[PDB]
Amino acid sequence: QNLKSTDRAVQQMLDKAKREGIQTVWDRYEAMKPQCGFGETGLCCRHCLQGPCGILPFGDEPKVGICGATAEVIVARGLDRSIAAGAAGHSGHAKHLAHTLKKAVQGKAASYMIKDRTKLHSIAKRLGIPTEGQKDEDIALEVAKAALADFHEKDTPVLWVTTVLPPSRVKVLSAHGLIPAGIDHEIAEIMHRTSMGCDADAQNLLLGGLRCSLADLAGCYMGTDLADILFGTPAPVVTESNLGVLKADAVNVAVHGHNPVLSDIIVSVSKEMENEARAAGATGINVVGICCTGNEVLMRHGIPACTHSVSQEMAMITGALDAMILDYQCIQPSVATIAECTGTTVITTMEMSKITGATHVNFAEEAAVENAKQILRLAIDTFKRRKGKPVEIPNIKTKVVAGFSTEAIINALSKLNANDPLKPLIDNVVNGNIRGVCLFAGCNNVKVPQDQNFTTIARKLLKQNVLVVATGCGAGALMRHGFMDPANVDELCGDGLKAVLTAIGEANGLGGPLPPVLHMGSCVDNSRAVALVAALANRLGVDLDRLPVVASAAEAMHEKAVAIGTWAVTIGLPTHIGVLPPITGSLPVTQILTSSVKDITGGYFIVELDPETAADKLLAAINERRAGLGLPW
Amino acid sequence: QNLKSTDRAVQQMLDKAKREGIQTVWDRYEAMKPQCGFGETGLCCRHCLQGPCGILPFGDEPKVGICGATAEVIVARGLDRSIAAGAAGHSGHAKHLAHTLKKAVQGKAASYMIKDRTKLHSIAKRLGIPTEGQKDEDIALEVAKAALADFHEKDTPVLWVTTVLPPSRVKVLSAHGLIPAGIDHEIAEIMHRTSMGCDADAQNLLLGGLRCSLADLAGCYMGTDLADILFGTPAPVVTESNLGVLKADAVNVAVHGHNPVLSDIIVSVSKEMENEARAAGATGINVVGICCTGNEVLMRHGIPACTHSVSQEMAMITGALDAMILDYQCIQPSVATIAECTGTTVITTMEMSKITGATHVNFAEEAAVENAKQILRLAIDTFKRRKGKPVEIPNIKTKVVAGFSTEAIINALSKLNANDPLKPLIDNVVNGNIRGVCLFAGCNNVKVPQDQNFTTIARKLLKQNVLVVATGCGAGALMRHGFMDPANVDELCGDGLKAVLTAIGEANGLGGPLPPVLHMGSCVDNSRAVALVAALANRLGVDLDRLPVVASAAEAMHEKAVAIGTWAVTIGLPTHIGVLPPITGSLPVTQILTSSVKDITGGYFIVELDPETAADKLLAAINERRAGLGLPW
Ligand SMILES: c1ccc(C[n+]2ccc(-c3cc[n+](Cc4ccccc4)cc3)cc2)cc1
Ligand SMILES: c1ccc(C[n+]2ccc(-c3cc[n+](Cc4ccccc4)cc3)cc2)cc1
Ligand code: SF4
Ligand code: SF4
Ligand code: FES
Ligand code: FES
């Protein structure tokens, strides 16, 4: 059980599932072995009915595809389509948010409103939309128009790429023709060039891949900015993590997915229907949370985080989980089957994301509350069946400090310098108390013992005075193991990082150091770490590829993670991935992604499956960047 | 050699290649066997780094994906991504044409102009763009704006879907939410919903797939309409087919790809540089043609068709092929390698479609002639090396009649009824001389003896009074075996079809029957067959699913072909495919594509790998539709 997940609560619920014969993800993974060499190394293509074409990594034929596609071209095309799929996911998420804002300022969905007025004004000014002398609805609709424009071609390029990167970085990207023209446009062109008979050069293909990763970066920032406008900009919050957030006597409602347009409304509406949950017998309605929509309502409402990706099923095995509200993404459809055994009621709410056997509730912004009131009642009814029955909640949970948006981070820093909030951070970078910055992002993965890479590399980095932030399932892994609890800054952080954190946190009326890891939100909110990093570059007058900033998708699983790592490389960062990417089948392609791309964007990939060696390689990247700045290390 | 291609010239050049050790596609296909059951049956997914997940078609585990994706969901997601890739190809083609028209009417590329004024006016009126009182450049720019709008969301849906189908058909499609909102939008949403953790219901997924096939249909029509505007609407032409179009003493220049924006300019410019080709020793410049751009210049300029998809390499083995101008699509990259042995100079001209080892010429509309003049010279220089050397051109070619655009077809029909050109065709449908209509479309495929399915099914249909049209590589297969020669109407056609063809052709001043097969252009120009079919439906006041019209992608290979077959199903047609699609791994998905979709669109798939049984099944579909209309059969 240790072999599967370092999460002790997950280890308990795995024993429950094995005892009851309810099949988990690890069981399916065991059933899948041995896995295919062609597929796991990228040497397989099916863009043709001319057959599935595999190339043996070594030995005699098959050496090449039937049409003449070499190993490098096949690998690059597959990787390109991975990036395109991730960009499509983030694009659709931000597109839905854009239509929500547009339908909100046009009287069409009264449940949605401009919560953060300063954020809207600042985004408009960055976009060049004039604010002074404009009604908030007109300027919000102008922002909403501008957001939708960025999906197609126009006069200006994708402004969520070109207005968010430092001008030097934008210029470097332009010099190679890497600035996107349209998010959906880049997606469609990638799907064009990777089809049979199209582009058949690895260098050209990978250049297009970088260009599409920037479309994904635009999608993430668009989603971040729009969610900030609609639902509020995160400010520091304190809540709990792991399955212990569940309580047997409440209606346990899990928000699962990625788009807050649904779950924020659920969170607000449920508190007033606790007026009705009492009569059903429960204390009230308990909105636990799963995955990045769970972290969206965590970062903006203090909602406890129940669990995350590879162990999402483990929320249900407790048997006290009544509802499961799904929008989309990183949802194992297995839950819909597992529900029949656990008594959970699975609900899907998107027209374009349905699971066979799962209840569908056609959700509209126009009826945002209505739907919600209905859905809660379902869970409430599902609690009535649970009356006076046995459940097994692992009495295990940790303390998490979150809501560290770039706004919140800079405000916390401004207590140390009012006129120059970035200067304290850069001062402590110079004097060695903060060595570098590392962003843990990305998924979990059934191939990696859950939360192993994140926690090990985080331990190593924190001992060595690295300021670590985290998003998505990386943030979930770090928070379920206590990395967001200042009470552990003592065990975890080095002396210099400890001094900086303890200065900032106690300066901000918190009364204690900032937590060992700065939870910066969901997967789309990786854009936040762009902003912050971008800001620092602007302050130093250098590009992102000169800063001691690295990223580590330590346990990546989803196509989104591949796209995110690619655009982390593109904007200039050393970017580690702790899962094998499907590139090993072509030495040239791996060489480009690890060595040659340094000469194009300044970033490069670090593919290390050993977290110890990965942490040393990240340390050496940070120390390289320190050396380039003529600083001690 | 018979086992590979029924094309006798191809059989000769295969012997040459084997004698010289130059590896062909069939050799690579032999090296690839045995092929993967998982991949060829759709039971493999790699949308995750959680491993390549395969499901055994029968037996024990692996039964399901690691995330819980059943066989049906995996199969549907793969098929959806195939359709998305095909729609991306056609979308990019039409998008490039749209920018060419926009850059032409805005003074930015003087080499391009509004060749067909009536076509532009008619398209504007259909779109609702007013013509009267507008300059041709302003209305052309309005059409160009409208074309680009259809890639993203707006107020109106994709107008190249909704303004081209009969209102009853559009209503049927709307009733199921199948009308696209944006070509690139549908592409991106498909790439979203097929990612991990997203949509996991086979019915829902296939509904989305139909909706995206309509985006592909819009892309094809957009390309057709734009190419008609830019370069002329096809009128009947006579030329030759197969490798015998090549001549040892000329500069043999092959246009290969799909976008005429390049090759039409090459065709026009080359005739004036024959003034320079004489001095190089050659007679002149011989613009043979390959694939659908070859058929574009065939249908609009009488350019001989050299060869097509699976045997494209066979153009080079002659050793007298000097140049190879590539834009994109269904180009085996192997040519770039094979050139080193054959002395051909391979040229790529698109920024987003490059082959390693192939000369790249960065082509712009702005420099359309300049590039062209350069490129020809290359070929001319490549002819100088060929001076006084041996070559092996199979002394084999056939006679092809083409240029039967829907405009040309209706004009030919109007000689029999001036006020009602469709009535003669429908009269002869009623009285049994024309039983049904069959559109042969789609690729060749190395798994099928080249041109076998097309020719066999065409023979059977023509004996039985079916009016057969053809596009793309289906048209190429039929023309290389003489199906476009009226001299064979005697051997091929039944008595009633013979009477109708002989009436129309001799009525049109041709002096002989129309050819046994009506070549209707390239793959995008399958939209033409939509128009014609749509018109007939409008004339009869019934939907497309009531007409004796079927389609047969008899030897499909490219993702485009899958998308085309899917939207042929969607608009109501019985649609055969003669290659195994990756659907067999899920009986529910195959059932939907073959049986249940009849209840949603009226069309259905016919998957038969035996051309005899396929022809009987097509005959029975046509006779079913005749029976539904209360007619003899
Ligand atoms: C030590 C040992 C094992 C690990 C975990 N691990 C890492 C990599 C692979 C693997 C397997 C097959 N390949 C094909 C291949 C290789 C070269 C060229 C082309 C293709 C690549 C890599 C398997 C397991 C980490 C550290
Ligand atoms: C007769 C004989 C042979 C042919 C040519 N042909 C047609 C089909 C297949 C084939 C192979 C494997 N399957 C897997 C499968 C089957 C059922 C359910 C799930 C999966 C499906 C089909 C192989 C060869 C045509 C006519
Ligand atoms: S398109 Fe080419 S590389 Fe891809 S599967 Fe078909 S033959 Fe192989
Ligand atoms: S995303 Fe799911 S179905 Fe697809 S390969 Fe990964 S585990 Fe298998
Ligand atoms: S051969 Fe296994 S992934 Fe295709
Ligand atoms: S297992 Fe062969 S196609 Fe994936």
Swiss-Prot record, chains A, B:
Name listed for the protein in its UniProt record: Carbon monoxide dehydrogenase 2
Q: What is its EC number?
A: 1.2.7.4
Q: Can you tell me which residues bind [Ni-4Fe-5S] cluster? A: H258, C292, C330, C443, C473, C523
Q: Does the keyword 4Fe-4S apply?
A: yes
How is the activity of this chain controlled?
Inactivated by O(2).
- One CC-aspect GO term: plasma membrane
Q: Which gene encodes it?
A: cooS2
- Domain description: Cluster B is an all-cysteinyl-liganded 4Fe-4S cluster; cluster C is a mixed Ni-Fe-S cluster which is the active site of CO oxidation. Cluster D is also an all-cysteinyl-liganded 4Fe-4S cluster that bridges the two subunits of the CODH dimer.
Q: Which cofactor does it need?
A: [4Fe-4S] cluster; [Ni-4Fe-5S] cluster
Q: SUPFAM superfamilies given for it?
A: Prismane protein-like
Briefly, what is this protein's role? Answer: CODH oxidizes carbon monoxide coupled, via CooF, to the reduction of a hydrogen cation by a hydrogenase (possibly CooH).
Q: Does the keyword Cell membrane apply?
A: yes
Task: Provide the membrane topology annotation.
Answer: Peripheral membrane protein
Question: Which amino acid positions bind [4Fe-4S] cluster 1, per UniProt?
Answer: C36, C44
Mind listing the GO biological process terms from this record? generation of precursor metabolites and energy; response to hydrogen peroxide
Which coarse location class describes where this protein primarily resides? cytoplasm
What molecular functions are annotated in GO for this chain? 4 iron, 4 sulfur cluster binding; anaerobic carbon-monoxide dehydrogenase activity; hydroxylamine reductase activity; nickel cation binding; peroxidase activity
Q: Where does [4Fe-4S] cluster 2 bind?
A: C45, C48, C53, C67
Which classification does the entry list for the species? Bacteria, Bacillati, Bacillota, Clostridia, Thermoanaerobacterales
Q: Describe the protein's quaternary organization and the partners it interacts with.
A: Homodimer.
Q: What class of enzyme is it?
A: oxidoreductase
Q: Which reaction does it catalyse?
A: CO + 2 oxidized [2Fe-2S]-[ferredoxin] + H2O = 2 reduced [2Fe-2S]-[ferredoxin] + CO2 + 2 H(+)
